[PDB]
Design an enzyme around this catalytic site. Structure first.
Site, short mmCIF file in Angstrom:
data_model
loop_
_atom_site.label_atom_id
_atom_site.label_comp_id
_atom_site.label_asym_id
_atom_site.label_seq_id
_atom_site.Cartn_x
_atom_site.Cartn_y
_atom_site.Cartn_z
CG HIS B 103 -1.80 -1.20 1.37
ND1 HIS B 103 -1.34 -2.32 2.03
CD2 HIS B 103 -3.08 -1.48 1.01
CE1 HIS B 103 -2.28 -3.25 2.04
NE2 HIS B 103 -3.34 -2.76 1.42
CG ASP B 204 36.61 -31.15 12.94
OD1 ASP B 204 37.73 -31.74 12.88
OD2 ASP B 204 35.56 -31.72 12.59
CG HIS B 207 37.43 -31.60 9.19
ND1 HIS B 207 37.72 -30.40 9.83
CD2 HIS B 207 37.00 -31.27 7.95
CE1 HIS B 207 37.52 -29.40 8.99
NE2 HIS B 207 37.11 -29.90 7.83
CG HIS B 212 39.26 -30.52 3.51
ND1 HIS B 212 38.13 -30.36 2.73
CD2 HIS B 212 38.95 -30.07 4.75
CE1 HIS B 212 37.17 -29.81 3.47
NE2 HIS B 212 37.64 -29.62 4.70
CG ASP B 356 34.07 -29.69 5.33
OD1 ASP B 356 34.33 -30.76 5.94
OD2 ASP B 356 34.85 -28.79 5.27
#
Ligand code: FES
Ligand code: FES
Ligand code: FES
Ligand SMILES: [Fe+3]
Ligand SMILES: [Fe+3]
Ligand SMILES: [Fe+3]
Lengths: 170, 448, 425, 170, 170, 433
Positions: B103, B204, B207, B212, B356
């Site tokens: 409006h 982390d 990992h 990787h 990931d």
């Protein structure tokens, strides 16, 4: 620009179909070495949602992009896939490309400017499915026997990507 | 809801799978974390001039963040107070006003209702615009980074960062003109609980060498030593009172940067000033590679220079925004080069980040099964091999690889979940680290 | 939530539409059926050599099922006990270990946590691996078929099959080397409640002539633990065509079945069965499709479809049975494709509350059944009837009402009381 | 292998377009008798998710498959649809095929080996929509100014089929 | 009806690729005036789900349709997008069309009857994505050198449209 | 929730955001609005001959609506009483029976179970069919329009429309043979709460000049005891027709008779453009002549079915013209309708965020500039632009939500409009003036 002859148009589509086959069958080394030129710029810019009134220029290779790679950088992306330690690709996933609307135009020194639409379906694991649509703006040069791409710009349709990644070639 | 949730065990360093899955836990998080904590909105660099704005999220709420005429920053809920229509659909721009296109109600840069069509004719000047501002959000800034908070009872942003400022000053202020953000951001959806990526980035290191392995192979350099998680301490882990933490790999800041030399030159050129302003112990950090998070849901790699905010979309989904960190006074080509390298590794087609996605989504969706979900997740790596440190504030874990920062993250999560208000959190300020029981750890380490 | 639910009316024989729709009821099934009962995992033939494994489901939980070095079979939840990552993404293969690829924790063939990267340097050997096995699942086998169970208080598999073993021995042991499964399985999603397909296979001869009009004299059975089937006499083909290996197989072995199991079981050996093993395994004996219907909440299932073949059948005969079973009942089955809407539609109508407020009828042939002097369980006359629905829903209700296995066993001796025509046979 | 000439490529694509039209319009008998050779093997193998180190051979026609048909078996599949008792097809559903990446190669005795990508969009009832993507590998032989397929191998992209059935031809 | 020659088929597909490009790039004026004939009937009938036994004729231009337009009505639909008050298109959305199965036939008076399959992928705002599949039945006439469409019939696959609107040209 | 919900503030004139978002609120609307009110099913014109049927929705429930042999209309739940399968999958057609294709049970035009295959052989004639009929729905009609209701304690359809009849009569009966519906309907999904498009049609003149600005560049408000309302733009019925012509002419040839039958104050409205709604979920534009039913699909989605209104005695060319013009503006590809989509969806989905959701929505425009009228029954607001009809809509919404049965609503028949406190508004205005 001057549209290519139907015979050259044929040749460009046949090239794109071979390219799709190599990429659907994990022949990435054959694709890169056989179908990408050593002077490649491979570019997928980030487009933001801007009001029509916004006068800022469109993204350049100096600005944010998901891909912005030369040949050695593509090679690294390709070579990583040949490690048996890409856990997400063991077992391997599936990809299928639907290329349409190929329009090829004459450039200088026998080079071509080529546009296409691409629809990408991706399947992996048990029930994962993702879909992408893009436009592709290529510059090709002839590599008897074939073509090689030496500029590739990829224009994604979705502002927020609905996939875990965009790790696939176009 | 007990006041002492068993969802997180801070004695044995484990968390219930329910935290990645259960809807009731998620709704409490929204109430006791996302509606109470300071959340990352962006940086002055993303809206650097008066009238510049961006749209962003705070968890599931849309906001508009605007650079005011006076040069201060304000934010408000991106929803009209008439029938609730989203006011602004642009990602960014410059605007003196924001118009609701249902409006035509007009909001100013601070969310005030400044004009309504037909105010005289049809409302009979009886609508009082003063009560109809779009809902404001508190905004505070720290070294140019902009945060928002919905709770008037929250500490100041500076007290919420708390001893984490010791670390952030090192990098955000640094030895030059400081870091800033470069957009536009990447945005993507991921089918995971918001805590899986946050815990990954906060704590982390383990990992990296497994997950990787392939990418580290292609990159080479110092970080390739990590590949395969094999018997070859690298660095340190940090955690703090409000859950903020990071791991650091010594001497590795530019290690992912393949090309890449403007950023390394920048560090070498500015590290002497970090030593001057912040000491040798922070100089060490300035040239190290960090993976960190600012509680609850902002993560970053310093060195690689990716910067992410993980916006929850229910317990099983997120939308992640990815920017690049660059020094504001780095030359144009260095800024572009950092952006290319951070994006090639940690963007939506990241050579590392792409690895990931399944780790995140899977650790979430396994819990669709009731038998699978009835269990605890372990984060005990290196417990007891950490404690208070005589130079570094907070809690410090020896080595880069361990779970010290998981322990600190989940300890604060539980504290927020159990606290009916900020006052209840503040009441336990002094004893926050009593669960890190090896008080003598560093006295022994540093004199052995 | 009482120990006498009105969702199933066993008097009577109707069931509330809510059983196909309501989430609360679903969650109770997960607790009191799927977490309690023995569920179909597959067959030795699917992982027949030491080290071979498959991945499969037990309701919504993923498991790894592994042939150990010593010839036993073990299963475990397919989720790492570090941060929960799914361990194994292969459908099948051979493996001496299962590695979680987030941080590289290594699981043995029984789910034991056997190795962790940097256990010495980084965990300081303080990680207690003995406490961190992937959650084991009890595995028992019957005639090569492999079942799994989560409840340490459950009866043995053979007691859970109980009197249905009389019928299973006939076809699973049979007259030669017995039946086995042939994969890999078809898998598909279907937007229905898990009980619609199951009730269809367990007890529904009525739809066959209407639903399966194209393409183109018995009894019904139910048992204490819900297991049931209908048999059409003399029809153990009848989609395989007269002279083929399957036909020659039944002819060369039915003499043995008559010797081993008697003439009343020779009759069933050459009959065509549509059956179910409670809760969610279904099969057609004769046609030789074999299905497990994994629930995915109250409104969806993922169905896995294998072929049953005699283990000693020649390769061409195994292949032929596979081709006919798949053409009729596979994902593009000439019969199965007809049933999809029946399944899904009986589920989704219940989206509206007015619609959902009602009962579904399974009264057909009530009173034309009772205990039988030769055949154990309850035996209904004729192939077309709802005897098997009645036995299925009765045991569904018993399990839902009982807090544990002990309270189920309490009513062993009185299970068939709802079948009141005691002298029918 | 030698790509066919541009004229033969055209003819193959035209044939595939006509095939799709017949299948989209319920002319199943026309399709089967006009476009499928009597020596047909029509095959859609089941591919399981296997680790790369798995040395087992890919599926053969002796192994599990969703379709594994000769002419008479296809004929039966087709004739079922003409029974007037196919309740799921009353009212009838819709199907639309997007064929792309048609690559034809010269085989012996003037036969063609032909590769294509197919995307199948199915609609039924009020709101039901399902989507399939497949690789198709055909051998075609000439048929009086058209072709007939005599080997058809269909490679589905998804391990778990997210549709009630796969009862459509490709 | 007689299929067009390969050279005419190429011309018709080139035309359709240009038309897609104009529609993807917001050149709606250029499309309307360059590719649509002044005698256009642009028509998208509403089909109901009817039993096979039902004998009622299919829809005519006198019956319900989502689009039932002449040149002036199309121009209105086009011109509205240039108003600068289409809030839903600020920032603008994306559309990409995948056209396949183009089959053209000789009609009367040098005109062409052309069939095609269309897949339309739409993206807007952050995460909105919608997809439509349709059949298209055109009558084209020469507009040397090129074509104009003078009859266009669009057949939607879905009975219930899973999109906010159908406000895009085909 | 309780008996006196704070979800709607009738004073004040605001509604909680939660009413567009909360599942508990939605479920209670299903119990106390959709399972209790008269819902729009269609019009005799959609199924004009004996045996003619259509399938349609009542909120989330599927129904079959059948023209009986005797010329009356029955409706029943489109679900089989064996295993629950949907019986009928056709939009429309002719049938003397409805067969469930799972096992073949056969249903009458009224829902009775008339035959089951193998009743004698397999069922041993022991099946009690009279106990097994598909669940009936109360059907009543008004001026050819067909409504259904699940609540046996509910008032008559004409009582339910009540004083809104004064206005419907003007247009539905009118000066000719009356209005009817032309299908097949367009159907689409929209990711909004059902109340956003309903409140837009019932009361939102305000958005027209802003939202539909692109398309435009090419009066009074009413509300009633049971929530029904509309706004009117005087002398404007055809204003949004591009052609004249058949419609324009139909009005002129029929207006005189409206004046005679109904009075000059119903004739003013006969030639006005209305945006209106019949509570809860039927909306329409008189003039433009689109006709919509907004079927909820949970709190955040609808399926909207769109028909065309036409004079039943108009000629085929006139009916066709009105259909073209009504569809071009308000169909799925509507030149105006397409503008509203984001308005609807956005107003719903912003409330995904809890901070955003904690707020009220304002509908105060023109509060006080409204009240009981001399001529016109219900409550009337001056001007076309204002929010009177929003206020009456939400007042009755609140009344239904608070009431545990129709009795409890009927209890407040005399008190309904207390909240509009300006009793003397129209006297003052008209005496001034
Ligand atoms: S909703 Fe924003 S002006 Fe009305
Ligand atoms: S989640 Fe499995 S090794 Fe860490
Ligand atoms: S479900 Fe309708 S006849 Fe059986
Ligand atoms: Fe990582
Ligand atoms: Fe069947
Ligand atoms: Fe509007």
């Amino acid at each position: 620009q001057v549209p290519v002859t139907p015979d050259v148009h044929y040749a460009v589509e046949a090239h794109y179909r071979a390219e799709v086959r190599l990429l659907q069958t994990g022949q990435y080394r054959e694709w890169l070495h056989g179908m990408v030129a050593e002077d490649i710029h491979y570019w997928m810019p980030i487009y933001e949602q801007r009001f029509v009134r916004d006068r800022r220029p469109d993204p350049t290779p100096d600005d944010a992009a998901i891909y912005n790679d030369d040949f050695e950088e593509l090679k690294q992306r390709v070579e990583r896939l040949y490690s048996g330690q890409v856990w997400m690709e063991d077992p391997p996933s599936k990809i299928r490309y639907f290329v349409s609307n190929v329009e090829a135009f004459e450039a200088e020194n026998g080079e071509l400017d080529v546009l296409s639409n691409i629809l990408v379906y991706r399947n992996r694991r048990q029930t994962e499915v993702t879909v992408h649509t893009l436009g592709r703006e290529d510059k090709l040069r002839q590599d008897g026997n074939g073509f090689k791409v030496f500029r590739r710009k990829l224009i994604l349709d979705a502002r927020v990507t609905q996939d875990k990644n965009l790790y696939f070639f176009c | 809801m007990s006041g002492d949730t068993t969802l997180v065990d801070t004695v044995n360093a484990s968390q219930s799978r329910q935290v990645f899955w259960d809807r009731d836990v998620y709704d409490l998080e929204i109430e006791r974390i996302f509606s109470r904590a300071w959340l990352m909105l962006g940086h002055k660099s993303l809206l650097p001039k008066p009238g510049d704005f961006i749209t962003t999220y705070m968890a599931e709420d849309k906001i508009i963040l605007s650079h005011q005429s006076d040069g201060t920053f304000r934010a408000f809920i991106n929803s009209c107070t008439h029938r609730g229509n989203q006011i602004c659909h642009a990602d960014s721009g410059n605007a003196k006003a924001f118009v609701c296109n249902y409006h035509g109600w007009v909001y100013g840069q601070d969310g005030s209702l400044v004009d309504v069509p037909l105010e005289s004719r049809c409302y009979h000047n009886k609508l009082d615009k003063q009560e109809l501002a779009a809902k404001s959000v508190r905004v505070e800034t720290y070294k140019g980074f902009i945060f928002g908070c919905h709770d008037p009872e929250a500490p100041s942003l500076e007290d919420y960062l708390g001893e984490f400022r010791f670390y952030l000053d090192t990098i955000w202020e640094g030895g030059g003109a400081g870091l800033e953000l470069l957009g536009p951001p990447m945005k993507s959806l991921l089918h995971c609980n918001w805590k899986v990526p946050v815990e990954n980035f906060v704590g982390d290191g383990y990992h990296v060498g497994w997950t990787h392995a392939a990418a580290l192979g292609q990159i080479g350099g110092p970080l390739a030593g990590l590949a395969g998680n094999r018997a070859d301490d690298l660095g340190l882990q940090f955690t703090t009172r409000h859950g903020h933490g990071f791991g650091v790999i010594d001497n590795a800041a530019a290690a992912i940067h393949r090309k890449g030399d403007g950023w390394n030159k920048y560090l070498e050129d500015t590290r002497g000033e970090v030593r001057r302003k912040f000491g040798a112990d922070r100089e060490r950090l300035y040239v190290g590679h960090w993976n960190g998070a600012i509680f609850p849901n902002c993560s970053f790699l310093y060195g690689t220079n990716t910067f992410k905010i993980w916006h929850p979309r229910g317990p099983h989904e997120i939308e992640v925004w990815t920017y690049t960190m660059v020094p504001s006074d780095a030359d144009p080509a260095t800024k572009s080069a950092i952006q290319r390298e951070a994006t090639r590794t940690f963007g939506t087609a990241g050579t590392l980040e792409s690895d990931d996605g399944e780790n995140m989504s899977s650790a979430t969706y396994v819990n669709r099964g009731v038998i699978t979900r009835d269990g605890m997740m372990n984060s005990t790596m290196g417990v007891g091999y950490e404690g208070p440190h005589p130079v570094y504030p907070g809690i410090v874990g020896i080595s880069f690889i361990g779970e010290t920062s998981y322990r600190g993250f989940y300890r604060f999560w539980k504290e927020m979940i159990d606290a009916p208000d900020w006052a209840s959190v503040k009441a336990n300020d002094d004893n926050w680290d009593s669960v890190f029981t090896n008080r003598n750890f560093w006295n022994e380490k540093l004199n052995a």
